[PDB]
Write an enzyme that holds these catalytic residues in place. Structure first.
Site, PDB file in Angstrom:
ATOM      1  N   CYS B 432       0.808  -1.215   0.000  1.00 58.30           N
ATOM      2  CA  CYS B 432       0.000   0.000   0.000  1.00 58.30           C
ATOM      3  C   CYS B 432       0.845   1.270   0.000  1.00 58.30           C
ATOM      4  O   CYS B 432       0.759   2.073  -0.938  1.00 58.30           O
ATOM      5  CB  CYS B 432      -0.919   0.020   1.214  1.00 58.30           C
ATOM      6  SG  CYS B 432      -2.258  -1.130   1.148  1.00 58.30           S
ATOM      7  N   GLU B 434       4.311   1.288   1.707  1.00 59.58           N
ATOM      8  CA  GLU B 434       5.484   0.964   2.513  1.00 59.58           C
ATOM      9  C   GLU B 434       6.759   1.018   1.685  1.00 59.58           C
ATOM     10  O   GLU B 434       6.949   0.161   0.807  1.00 59.58           O
ATOM     11  CB  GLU B 434       5.314  -0.420   3.114  1.00 59.58           C
ATOM     12  CG  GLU B 434       4.022  -0.614   3.854  1.00 59.58           C
ATOM     13  CD  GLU B 434       3.030  -1.379   2.997  1.00 59.58           C
ATOM     14  OE1 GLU B 434       3.100  -2.628   2.998  1.00 59.58           O
ATOM     15  OE2 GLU B 434       2.166  -0.749   2.354  1.00 59.58           O
TER      16      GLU B 434
END
Lengths: 811, 792
Positions: B432, B434
């Protein structure tokens, strides 16, 4: 200071007149019955332990290995049959039938099944496998394929390492097929604090765990495994306590009933709590000794300095008679003979004689450098003379300060012909241990593991019989440019016939040794990784420093000292062979390289009749031999041994430890000689090899002092896993007080000349031949094989004949 | 400024609809083969067992090429379906044989035959999984916290790990066969003088065995494409198949020599990784950087064919799917495997990195408009005006992509965790939000969800949850003297549950290293080959563990509500607040006092309106979590680091938290990421952006997530794109890490709900990823609909 009845037999025999020959006392009738129940027992294979451990494994697939092993040992302790034999004061049974064997399939299993029908009748160490026992093991073995330590260890080894093992260069079968063992645990700690104290150290260590890292997670798993294991262990003794009482409630003899009631009380105090009487102290000793070998089939679980850690419990116990104390020690010696172990039918011939090699030593020094003789020291020599069974592998330590009394009493006992005690030399061992980094004070506390392997007790993971390694075979292979038959096992070190001197052969020998020792170390270390990954032992570990303090098992490095020790074979064979070349070719130029090669390949004409060969056999067969105080040939044997010992020394194991060479044969110098062809010393193909550092069979001819002077020329200090030297004596030659003084004089000479060890058979050539012709009448003839003693009639005839083969010494 | 988008071929369209019409199945062939592989190989070391697992699968899985595709390779026979991976866990699959077709979040069909086959394979697995071992390592304290909803480590407990961007470029230049020679030479140069070489040489041999099987897998696709070319009547498709068959012979065995080969290399790596393990967030990463040289060297290829190949790659990325157990399927809702692909940014030497393929990837998004890839752009002070404006122009299509990431925060953020300047400049995005240095990191970037709002709950009930005592007794709420006594109580509760969070992760970490290190994946990450260690044993250069905070804005607003309505303004007393929360603000009592207290608290200032007071409490509650996480380490020698993102579970985990001091009623959704509470940011998008940027984003180096949702009207026209990009540069210049935009009308979402059959192509942004809106559960739909609508 008041009188103590452990003196009551030394104010006689040592402090009241009476020249060097004193004789031995007699055991009670009880000790004689127990002794015989062992001798006449038929050894079976039993199934209960294997099936219980197989079930513990099925029910706990998900746990980390250390906790699975705790669940294994808890199921076995809680459910193994509890057997108390007629007449014993010390109780605890590994097998239902005496002198029988469990199966440990966690290590290996398939030879047991392959051998369901043939084991009752094989040449070495047969066992009886009932039909029902086979069925239950067949059902248990369905779980294990690929799930054993051995199967994991093989898949870590390279294909060349395994080829070399197939073809007789060396083997790691011992810890590959079975457990490790080879350890002397902290008996004294359990004597003082008990299993409960062990549990309490682990609670303290668990309560002080640093938990600020990932590192606490596995350590906590280790600590919980230990606590669970010793909860089951405490339970196991309670279980014996209860069966003593059940036997007591129905026993008809009142004095036996009173004994059984006391055994129950004993098992309620020890090993859960520290011992408070000498009888308890023996029961603690024996619970540890047996339970260790329920947890794993590793042999050479060695009592060690049993005279030191037991003596304080004897001195505190003024209540008991001299002869009852001695009777307790005797039952301990008999219980030690109850243990047994089956192996596959080839490994059985290498550990021959229903042998678990549990070594017990007496005397020596304290940690402060003072002589450590005490009354129990002598009581242990007495027990050996009472019971005269193969076990324990009884032993003495010797140093400059050894009382003449103690060396004379030991010699007096050796003269019984049992092979015990063996003799080990502090003055070489302590320096040798310090050179491997053992502290001086830990070094002074050394005991002997198995046959001849020294160790700082309850401080060491030793791996003292990791491997068997054939230096004769490496010589064969060096002379055939690195092949053995139709297989290239080693590098190409040039063909023999193109050597220009001895510089060319030694360089060729060093390169082969370097290649094969590296394969040895790989095979050893693969077994080491496998025991760590699949079978770390929470029960054993708690009794060696510094497992508990570090929160790690012995298998993953928790010990203070860590070693791996592989064993050289055919040392005299190799040295004599190399010397024959050096003089009969390069110096006396009395045959040439190319005729030797042909003579070897021809096997000296053992099928031709070729007289150039059957007689350059003689030219080599009659060259100067190791073992005749001749510096020429002895220094070549020194060099050939140093070539092996200095390679081994270069490597390390996964527990942070050093490899260290030993030199000892157990019973495999026959079997492993089958793996070597004709040799330059004139030895024919497949003929036996020299036991330990002993000179070749029958080739030391200038008498025991010349032989012992030769052996002492070898570098014993560097073979810090232990050297072994056999001698055999005509009995008439040691009789009388003149015999004992010659005999102690020899040992003193050998040890001052810096040899590490010596032991003696004392027997008539016809006594052995008679046992051969008439086995059923010599069931109890116990002689020394190598570093241990066995019933001569259970040995395969060709090992029997090799023992007969040995030089008979006379003064 | 407004350039519009081209269209894809009819082929791309047909391939798109194949995905979008596809019914998802559970398939069994991979699970049965892996099970068979484990049975046959119980004696090997783990790494070799794992090599034999992927060699049985690589050599024996069904190879299936789909109609019209130019880039080939299928995880499953059926489009957009899921393999089972019983290595990690199995039992939820069998428990759910007759209900997975009919469950709300991500249903899958399970043919009767399929379930019989899995039933047979599952018999091997009891007690042999990674999860069963990981559980045995956890304290009962940590297990109790997790079933009480304080936090969960389910992601890697039940499935593989994933969450890595592999050395795509290395395979592109040297191939599998080149991987094999690195390992052969590492093997030949092994120091063999101690015992440490033995295990390293197992690893090397396991790696070699895997890559020889991996070549066979590609050559099996060459054989299939050849088989299909025999029987093709369409002669242009026949020559296509013939050329595909040639491609799969060449790549990934050797380096790629054409852009089409290059694309094929990429898809083979991308799919094979997810055959080896079910770990998701297998992120393509800087696809525009490593793929571009193969495009620039292919002078023969036409620009519309090059674009057609990138489109098919986009479409292929949507062929992957992953079932999970019924409950965690809701936290990762939408048939999502979060393959994050980014373009733009800088080079390791500091220059802007925009290239023609950068814009071709944006076009691909506009051509295909499916949920995958999780398309992203990197922004930095050097981002060319045209690239941010083109990107914004693509955001305007209402798909959620691209999400936008800020080099000016992320590089310092990584550099604070020890990553070198040059590796940090090369960062991509995983899953997502990171970030990592690619092919250099074992990141564990979605190890756990941790519920900060639930810790607040527990802090105020004196460590109780339920009425079961669950944390330290930091004091009863009524007995607080000031905010100081609260914060001290909150910190102690935080330290207690973070330490259990760390235990839970590290157990799962030890379990994976010990039972399932990966010989295929590891070869593609520095420094595994050099060290002779898997990723699970710490072979990577950099090593992290990333857990994620839930309920940040929920926690900030409540802690301020207490600070203002209780201490500063005396609108109520600690005792009234305690009793109010207990009674759920009288949601069912009718108690007028509790309902007006509730109204008082509801109307306290909120995070997201550029009010410094309430905003600094938001920063402070986030810092309390991020500062504790920072303190711990993992078995790989690496550092834990906090993230803040919701994937699809700010609703699911909302049901774990009772009434809160800010007015929220029990079991009610929580705030997504670092976004302000739904609807509570009222002064519009710039004001909200200024609040969110006041948080400490550098500390949360596993990545923050910030949703905004605009009225489409508001971004139209050239002044639309101008205000839109100013907002971004505003947010990133104030050192926020990430922002991503829904661009949609409220009615379009309501109509999707009411007539889902007409809106199956409707793709919106959930959180860090996009999914088909109609596949999401109603409560997630409603939560997305409930988000603040922005306008300029």
């Amino acid at each position: 200071h008041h009188h103590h009845h452990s003196q009551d037999h030394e104010n006689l025999y040592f402090q009241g007149s009476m020249g060097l020959e004193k004789g031995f006392t007699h055991p009670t009738d009880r000790v004689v019955r127990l002794k015989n129940m062992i001798l006449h027992a038929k050894p079976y294979v039993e199934s209960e332990r294997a099936v219980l451990a197989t079930e513990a494994y099925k029910e706990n697939e998900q746990l980390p290995a250390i906790m699975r092993r705790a669940k294994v040992v808890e199921k076995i302790f809680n459910e193994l049959p509890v057997t108390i034999r007629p007449d014993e004061l010390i109780v605890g049974a590994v097998t239902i039938n005496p002198r029988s064997t469990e199966i440990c399939p966690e290590f290996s299993y398939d030879w047991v099944e392959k051998e369901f029908d043939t084991m009752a009748h094989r040449v070495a160490d047969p066992f009886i496998i009932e039909k029902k026992t086979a069925d239950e093991l067949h059902q248990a073995f369905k779980y294990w394929p690929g799930k054993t330590t051995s199967s994991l260890a093989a898949s870590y080894m390279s294909e060349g390492t395994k080829e070399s093992m197939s073809n007789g260069v060396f083997t790691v079968g011992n810890y590959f097929f079975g457990g490790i063992g080879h350890v002397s645990v902290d008996y004294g700690k359990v004597l003082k604090i008990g299993f409960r104290g062990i549990i309490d150290e682990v609670t303290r260590a668990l309560e002080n765990l640093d938990r600020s890292t990932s590192d606490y997670i596995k350590k906590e798993q280790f600590y919980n495994a230990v606590i669970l294991s010793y909860q089951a262990a405490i339970n196991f003794a309670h279980r014996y306590a209860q069966e003593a009482s059940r036997l007591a409630r129905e026993e008809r003899d009142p004095t036996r009933q009173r004994e059984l009631e006391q055994i129950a009380s004993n098992c309620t105090r020890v090993p859960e709590y520290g011992a408070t009487t000498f009888w308890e102290a023996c029961q603690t000793f024996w619970f540890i000794q047996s339970m260790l070998q329920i947890e794993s089939s590793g042999h050479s679980i060695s009592p060690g300095r049993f005279d030191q850690y037991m003596y304080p419990y004897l001195a505190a116990d003024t209540a008991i008679s001299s002869e009852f104390a001695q009777e307790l020690v005797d039952c301990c010696w008999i219980k030690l003979n109850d243990i047994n172990k089956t192996r596959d039918e080839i490994s059985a011939q290498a550990f021959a004689g229903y042998a678990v090699f549990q070594n017990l030593c007496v005397g020596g020094q304290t940690e402060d450098g003072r002589d450590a003789t005490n009354p129990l020291t002598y009581m242990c020599m007495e027990a050996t003379a009472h019971v005269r069974l193969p076990q324990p592998s009884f032993s003495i330590r010797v140093w400059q300060g050894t009382p003449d009394e103690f060396l004379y009493r030991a010699c007096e006992l050796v003269r019984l012909g049992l092979g015990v005690p063996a003799m080990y030399n502090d003055e070489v061992i302590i320096p040798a241990l310090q050179n491997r980094g053992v502290s001086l004070h830990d070094a002074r506390d050394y005991c002997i593991i198995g046959c001849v392997e020294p160790q700082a007790p309850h401080r060491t993971e030793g791996w003292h019989d990791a491997a068997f390694f054939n230096v004769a075979k490496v010589l064969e292979i060096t002379l055939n440019n690195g092949r053995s038959g139709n297989k290239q096992l080693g590098p190409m070190t040039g063909e023999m016939t193109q050597y220009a001197g001895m510089d060319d052969f030694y360089a060729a020998f060093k390169k082969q040794m370097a290649h094969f020792v590296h394969q040895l170390v790989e095979a050893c270390n693969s077994v080491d990784i496998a025991h760590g990954e699949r079978c770390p032992l929470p029960f054993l570990s708690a009794l060696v420093d510094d497992c508990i303090g570090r929160g790690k098992s012995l298998q993953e490095g928790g010990a203070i000292y860590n070693f791996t020790g592989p064993q050289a074979f055919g040392i005299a064979d190799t040295g004599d062979s190399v010397y024959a070349i050096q003089k009969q070719v390069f110096e006396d130029r009395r045959l040439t390289l190319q005729e030797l090669k042909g003579a070897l390949d021809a096997n000296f004409g053992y099928r031709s009749g070729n007289p150039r060969y059957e007689e350059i056999r003689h030219i080599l067969e009659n060259s100067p031999c190791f073992g005749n105080d001749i510096d020429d040939v002895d220094l070549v044997a020194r060099q050939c041994a140093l070539i092996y010992c200095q390679e081994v020394e270069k490597y390390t194991n996964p527990r942070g430890g050093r490899f260290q060479a030993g030199i000892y044969p157990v019973s495999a110098n026959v079997l492993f000689g089958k793996d070597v062809s004709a040799l330059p010393d004139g030895r024919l193909a497949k003929e036996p090899l020299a036991d330990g550092v002993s000179p070749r069979q029958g080739k030391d001819t200038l008498g025991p002092t010349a032989a012992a002077n030769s052996v002492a020329k070898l570098d014993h200090f560097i073979a810090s896993n232990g050297t072994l030297y056999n001698q055999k004596f005509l009995p008439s030659s040691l009789a009388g007080e003149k015999g004992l003084r010659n005999f102690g004089g020899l040992v003193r000479n050998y040890f001052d000349k810096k040899g590490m060890h010596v032991q003696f058979n004392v027997i008539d050539r016809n006594t052995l031949l008679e046992a051969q012709k008439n086995p059923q009448q010599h069931q109890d003839l116990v002689v020394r094989v190598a570093g241990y003693s066995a019933q001569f009639v259970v040995l395969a005839k060709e090992v029997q004949d090799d023992i007969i083969s040995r030089t008979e010494q006379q003064f």
